[PDB]
Amino acid sequence: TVASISSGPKHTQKVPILTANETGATMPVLPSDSIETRTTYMHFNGSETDVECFLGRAACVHVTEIQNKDATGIDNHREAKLFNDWKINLSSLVQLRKKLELFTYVRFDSEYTILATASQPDSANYSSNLVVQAMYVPPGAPNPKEWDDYTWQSASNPSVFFKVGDTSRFSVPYVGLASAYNCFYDGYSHDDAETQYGITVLNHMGSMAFRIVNEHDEHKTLVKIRVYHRAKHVEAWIPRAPRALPYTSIGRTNYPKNTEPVIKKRKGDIKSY
């Protein structure tokens, strides 16, 4: 594959470098169209910039917390973090979000990796070997209310049991209801004057609940859970303007008020180098 062909002097009626950008087209002008060039080869395929590679690596998409402690007298297990849940979404942590939002529609399979790390902030005689249970609770499935509900039986919901300090790994097929996931959605759930706007109404993927299976020890253990997402078998459509301003909320395109200029201001002239 040639990068540049050999091209010499020129004196024509054919002017490749004069165009009309109001047509909306970006004419494929090459260096050999405006200067004398020599032959060079690409020695390059562009593998690393393939959308499969671009979205094909794990990125942290959520961090949450649960803890192992005596549940005696706790009236709201959920609030006490005896167990916690995550309303599944990929737009909470901004790094992966900006990448995905480089496109309008996106379709792919997902590979999840869940890392659980223990912590004992105050006096403990040892570190306990806790087992985490991550259960997927799809829309319509009964949500856990107590860390040891009948819901954790998980007869139909899928769930993994892994050691804290260890990692959990599994993949999920493309689960969108449509032919592709929407990164943006200029619409509502119905024609209502007050209903929510944006993908907020589209990305209703249920949530996944986490808990520590072990009963409590004398001391209290804080387990932090990090979920990583890697896309595979990727397809992307309709490229768009990259995000410029900071995000403020999951799902909305909203940006903060009194935000700072994102375009750098010259320390001098428009003639400055």
């Binding site: 470098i17 494929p28 690596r57 428009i270």
Partner: protein, 236 residues
């Protein structure tokens, strides 16, 4: 039992590894694909589309005006604009090219820089765009700029001039992050003759500048960008 020996790295989680893993939803049948126009396969595809350069940084805040390059009537020899060619910073940092380029550590290839005249039809002008390859300073006058790669643009019927910034380098790749040894040079524009306005016409005409990559382009070593961040996890 097949005898085995586990190697260093066992149990590690390399975010970049590409392995198989059990499916949590066995026998699930995903929704059929339907045709959707505008499919993108490679980022190198979209960086070939040019976007506007906010060449006129000069303002106190982001404005439509930062994209307008002012041109002044009856000025001779003078400089219209200038900029270094660190495509991963400066004026280029917010463009589609600069934005995508920042997702990678290395870049190589030729850049496509365009200028579209928006002054009245009955006006005229001849400008000169110049690319100064690394090794010397940004040109300080037309004569100096003219000694390097350049294009004398005659404004007319065809509104846009496309000047290529041919890959001129010793090392075959440069860092997207501004690095001296890896500098790309300078870009400048000057009045070849001058801008002439017709009768009953007054003020300023502007130039719109565009940037895009040639099929020449190469990008490698994916990395996180400095164009996005957060202090706390976002919530619904």
């Amino acid at each position: 039992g097949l005898p085995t020996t586990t190697l260093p790295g066992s149990g590690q989680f390399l975010t970049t590894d590409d392995r198989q893993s059990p499916s949590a939803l066995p026998n699930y049948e995903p929704t059929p694909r339907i045709h959707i126009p505008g499919k993108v396969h490679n980022l190198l595809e979209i960086i070939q589309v040019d976007t506007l350069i906010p060449m006129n940084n000069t303002h106190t805040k982001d404005e439509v005006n930062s994209y307008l390059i002012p041109l002044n009537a009856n000025r001779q020899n003078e400089q219209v604009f200038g900029t270094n060619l660190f495509i991963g910073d400066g004026v280029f940092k917010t463009t589609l090219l600069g934005e995508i380029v920042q997702y990678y550590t290395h870049w190589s290839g030729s850049l496509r820089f365009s200028l579209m005249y928006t002054g009245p039809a009955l006006s005229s002008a001849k400008l000169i765009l110049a690319y100064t390859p690394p090794g010397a300073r940004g040109p300080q006058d037309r004569r100096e700029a003219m000694l390097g790669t350049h294009v004398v643009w005659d404004i007319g019927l065809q509104s846009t001039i496309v000047m290529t910034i041919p890959w001129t380098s010793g090392v075959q790749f440069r860092y997207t992050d501004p690095d001296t040894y890896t500098s790309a040079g300078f870009l400048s524009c000057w009045y070849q003759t001058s801008l002439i306005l017709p009768p009953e016409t007054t003020g300023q005409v502007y130039l719109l500048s565009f940037i895009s990559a040639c099929p020449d382009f190469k990008l490698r070593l994916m990395k996180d960008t400095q164009t996005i961040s957060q202090t706390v996890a976002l919530t619904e």
